[PDB]
RNA sequence: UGAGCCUGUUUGAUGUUCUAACGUUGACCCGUAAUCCGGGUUGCGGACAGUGUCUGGUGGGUAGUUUGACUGGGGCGGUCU
RNA sequence: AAUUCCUUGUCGGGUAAGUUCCGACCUGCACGAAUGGCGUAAUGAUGGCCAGGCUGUCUCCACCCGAGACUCAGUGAAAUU
RNA sequence: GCUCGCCGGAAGACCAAGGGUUCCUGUCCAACGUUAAUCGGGGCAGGGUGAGUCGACCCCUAAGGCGAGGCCGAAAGGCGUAGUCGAUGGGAAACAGGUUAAUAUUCCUGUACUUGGUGUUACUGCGAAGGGGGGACGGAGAAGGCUAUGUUGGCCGGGCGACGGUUGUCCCGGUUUAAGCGUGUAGGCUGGUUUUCCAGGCAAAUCCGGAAAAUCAAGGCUGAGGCGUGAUGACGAGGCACUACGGUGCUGAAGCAACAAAUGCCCUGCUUCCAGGAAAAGCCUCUAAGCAUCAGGUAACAUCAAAUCGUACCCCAAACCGACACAGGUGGUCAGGUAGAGAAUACCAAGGCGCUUGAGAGAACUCGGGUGAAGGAACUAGGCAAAAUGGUGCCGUAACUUCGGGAGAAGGCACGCUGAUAUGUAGGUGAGGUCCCUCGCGGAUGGAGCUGAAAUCAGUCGAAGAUACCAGCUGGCUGCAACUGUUUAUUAAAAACACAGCACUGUGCAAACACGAAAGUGGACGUAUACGGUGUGACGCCUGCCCGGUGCCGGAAGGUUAAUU
RNA sequence: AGGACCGAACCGACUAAUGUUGAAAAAUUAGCGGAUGACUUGUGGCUGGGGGUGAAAGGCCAAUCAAACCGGGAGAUAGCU
């Protein structure tokens, strides 16, 4: 039975990547929020 | 020629075809082609703005001369041709100086004919003149609406327009809808009427035929629910209400024209 | 064309004509190496069209709510001073 | 009658026997002409009825071949209280 | 180590996507492995990935994303021009043999090819952000030439058989060789050359396009396969001496022909149909401003350069998606023998496995199968389930019909083996020999050898010759929707939805209509034989009366009526 | 020639039995429908919540849909247990 997750690095990076986040005003807010909380990993990029 | 097909299958029982043995078999002219892509009805926002469109066959665009400039140089007809972007055939012409062009095909035009455009051109089919030089009571096609713009009226298969009266700097025309209109006398037009009048005597035969051309199914509003259309609901089959569009306006009788900028060029409306 | 003033003087409404505000999703030149944009010349409409404030009409297309109590179970009947 | 409450209406066919099926009658509680009327060859993992062949579906059950259930050695849950 | 069973269009071999040391060697058995474990895809330590030609990076674009100035919006922001990105698509070049415990078109041996820079010699009009060619394109169908591959014969090396016979029409094994270079065949397409002139290709053209004379009839482009060279080489059963069980040095026979044959190549070809079938660069040509002693261009020699990242292993699965060492899901390539129409079905080859708890007994009852005396739907809401028919060739076949159908209607007869026709028949391929010739991968005649259906007559065995796996049950009367299609992922597949056809109504182009505070965009690079909305649903015969109510369309003389003064 | 006919690969889901603390949070075995077309599959792209897409079942939008998920107003209100 086909399930929901079907991996693809290209799509992953084009969807939730660092440059994608920085391209928009709200993505910078996501980054600032995570930085304030103090996370070890910011984005999905290796 | 209209030909019925034999009933060798249920999808072939009701098929009538139009066949013309004079159309060219082979590739088209290359220097006058362009690529055309499909849309599905979607606009620049990505939304369906016109319904029931999608799919079909790949097509290429043939450039056509609705201007008919180039006065004074005769041209000869080379071959007639098929066009997937319209309901009328096209013709290729070669000019005396070595330039080729595509034009609309009128009735009775065949290979080996001579055509011309200008103020002093003859009066015969396929020739172009400003409407200040055509006799009153003539049949024309490919009519302009502004001097120097391009043909915009009577461009489909079998159609034409009639000149009725001339008075001043204006000409009065009767259109295919039963309407009288006024346009400037410096516009252009072409003698005769458009060809391929057999186009309306065809029967498709099966749903795949309409799917080949890019038409998707139509769903009735009485088969939906009250949250989709003003015609939905019911325990059984019920209507009990005045017919309306999918957005709440009355079909079957109401009017929708509102244009005060152009009301002065209408003499009498379609009856 | 009906109305004041001292046939002569202002303000109204109806219609003909004009060009100078305004429109041009008609043609040509330049920025420019470009079917966006701006400038220039020339045709075509022209005080119409269109927009702002105010005002009468229509408006389940969309939104927020109302639709009482008694009762040998509730509803239908009947009642409530 | 995909519609008929009274109703298993009445007459004929098929069965030894037929509240279902087929053909008619008109007393249509409450059919009817593009929210279409009456027909129709071919097509349907569509609803109803009847025959030939075939059988453990059944009178009415008997034997046999394999995996569990039982005994021995190792590992080892659960709902509820 | 010797037997036995299972798969074999897979349960074999190689990849992509996705994981990331699971790969090889040494040592250990606490916890993990549904049991024991000396074993492991487990613990610890060391080793392993070698490129001018394979990929990525690079040159060019599709759908689409961003977007200098620009237009638009309370802010935030939206859409777009010149540009610049984005593969699932276009763009140079390499093959055999040997080798490690683990890498191979990368390492060693033998023989090849592709693009640029620099110097010399010889000939000389070169030049882009511009003009032209080319790249460059659909569905279906047919038969002609071939190869991969197989079968038999010939040749070389062994054997003479645990129990009757086996010196022969006997048994087992081998018979392999590439890219590059020359030859330009089966076949496909197109007439060649010179001179004059011209309102076209934003300007120029010797290039493209068009008109007019003369002459010549054979010029050019394309193209699988075969043949020679590569090759006095490599490989090859076995043999000459030693073994750590992975091996060293040497030596080495034959290495031919006939037949059948693809869904692969010629073939982006040929024939036919309507629904009419991508873009840009590399590449070939022509010139403009400009330089002409220069710079530059074509040809020959010598020299240099081709950097950086991936390369282990799994990959229909115990290593990926399902919490699990889970009976599920996952795209591409390769295609042996005997029967058979076949990539179906049965037994095998190369190769790979026996699925990580066992040993006994032979109770009721549950699950998956086999057989049944007499009867044959008497069972049940209902023939639910089971039983039954099942191939090829020939005879033969109703009502009704839109003349295509119904139809495989229904129902019957033959089917194995051996001999003769004919020591292998009708067909298919085809060497030698004789002539002709522009002398070649030629033409005509010729038949040695190889392969091989269907049929008739006459005999013979058994209860049964389509013998196993495989493989339609048939007929009569009715309701609904004309027909092929779609739908409630996870209790409803239908009479519901769609449909070809028909009618009403709107729309004159800056169209009606829709997404948008606006700019803009789709409708459409379309123009009433075209577009949007609503109802009915092939086809045949048809579709009657009512405008009082509510809608819609036209009128405008009378009554009522807003802001404003 | 054909939304033609029989039938493997490929795409579906009509009947029955098993399973229901399952081998599986929708499967297995024996039968079943389409199979040159309105067909089927790989890679990348676009449409965002009173919104989209819908051969129309209130179907689908990450095991969640008569108004998705996440964080805030927030200790919303609760004549009721």
From Swiss-Prot, chain A:
Segments crossing the lipid bilayer: none
GO CC terms, sorted: cytoplasm; cytosolic large ribosomal subunit
Any one Gene Ontology molecular-function term assigned to this protein's record: structural constituent of ribosome
Pfam families in the record: Ribosomal_L34 (PF00468)
InterPro entries: Ribosomal_bL34, Ribosomal_bL34_CS
Protein family per UniProt: Belongs to the bacterial ribosomal protein bL34 family.
Record's protein name: Large ribosomal subunit protein bL34
Organism for this UniProt entry: Escherichia coli (strain K12)
Curated annotation (Swiss-Prot), chain B:
Pfam families noted in UniProt: Ribosomal_L2 (PF00181), Ribosomal_L2_C (PF03947)
GO biological process assignments: cytoplasmic translation; negative regulation of DNA-templated DNA replication initiation; ribosomal large subunit assembly
The protein's name: Large ribosomal subunit protein uL2
Description of how the protein assembles with itself and partners: Part of the 50S ribosomal subunit. Forms a bridge to the 30S subunit in the 70S ribosome, contacting the 16S rRNA. Interacts weakly with S6 in one of the 3.5 A resolved structures. In pull-down experiments interacts with CedA.
An example molecular function term from Gene Ontology annotations: RNA binding
Miscellaneous comment: This protein can be partially replaced in vivo by its H.marismortui (HmaL2) or human (L8, from the 60S cytoplasmic ribosome) homolog.
Low complexity bias: start-end ranges: 38-47
Classification via PANTHER family: LARGE RIBOSOMAL SUBUNIT PROTEIN UL2M, RIBOSOMAL PROTEIN L2
Upper taxonomic lineage: Bacteria, Pseudomonadati, Pseudomonadota, Gammaproteobacteria, Enterobacterales
Annotated positions of the N6-acetyllysine modification: 241
UniProt family annotation: Belongs to the universal ribosomal protein uL2 family.
Task performed by this protein: One of the primary rRNA binding proteins. Located near the base of the L1 stalk, it is probably also mobile. Required for association of the 30S and 50S subunits to form the 70S ribosome, for tRNA binding and peptide bond formation. It has been suggested to have peptidyltransferase activity; this is highly controversial.
Region Disordered, annotated ranges: 27-52, 220-271
NCBIfam families the record matches: rplB_bact (TIGR01171)
Organism: Escherichia coli (strain K12)
Cellular compartments per GO CC: cytoplasm; cytosol; cytosolic large ribosomal subunit; DnaA-L2 complex
UniProt keyword annotations, A-Z: Acetylation, Ribonucleoprotein, Ribosomal protein, RNA-binding, rRNA-binding
């Amino acid at each position: 039975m086909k399930r929901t997750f079907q991996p693809s690095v290209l799509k992953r990076n084009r969807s939730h990547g660092f440059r994608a986040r920085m391209a928009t005003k709200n993505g910078r807010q996501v980054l600032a929020r995570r930085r304030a909380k103090g996370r070890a990993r910011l984005t999905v990029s290796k | 020629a209209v030909v019925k097909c034999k009933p060798t299958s249920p999808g072939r029982r009701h098929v009538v075809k139009v066949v013309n043995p004079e159309l060219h078999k082979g590739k088209p002219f290359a220097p006058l082609l362009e690529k055309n892509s499909k849309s599905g009805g979607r606009n620049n926002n990505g939304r369906i703005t016109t319904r029931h469109i999608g799919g079909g066959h790949k097509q290429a665009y043939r450039i056509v001369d609705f201007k008919r400039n180039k006065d004074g140089i005769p041209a000869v007809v080379e071959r007639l041709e098929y066009d997937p972007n319209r309901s009328a055939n096209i013709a290729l012409v070669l000019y005396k100086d070595g330039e080729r062009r595509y034009i609309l095909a009128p009735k009775g035009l065949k290979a080996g004919d001579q055509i011309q455009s200008g103020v002093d051109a003859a009066i015969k089919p396929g020739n172009t003149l400003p409407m200040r030089n055509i006799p009153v009571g003539s049949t024309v096609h490919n009519v302009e609406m502004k001097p120097g713009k391009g043909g915009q009226l009577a461009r489909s298969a079998g159609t034409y327009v009639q000149i009725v009266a001339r008075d001043g700097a204006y000409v009065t025309l009767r259109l295919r809808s039963g309407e009288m209109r006024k346009v400037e006398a410096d516009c252009r037009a072409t003698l005769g009427e458009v060809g391929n009048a057999e186009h309306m005597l065809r029967v498709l035969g099966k749903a795949g035929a309409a799917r080949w051309r890019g038409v998707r199914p139509t769903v009735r509003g009485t088969a939906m629910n009250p949250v989709d259309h003003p015609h939905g609901g019911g325990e059984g089959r019920n209507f009990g209400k005045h017919p309306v569009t999918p957005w709440g306006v009355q079909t079957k009788g109401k009017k929708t024209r509102s244009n005060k900028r152009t009301d002065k060029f209408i003499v009498r409306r379609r009856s």
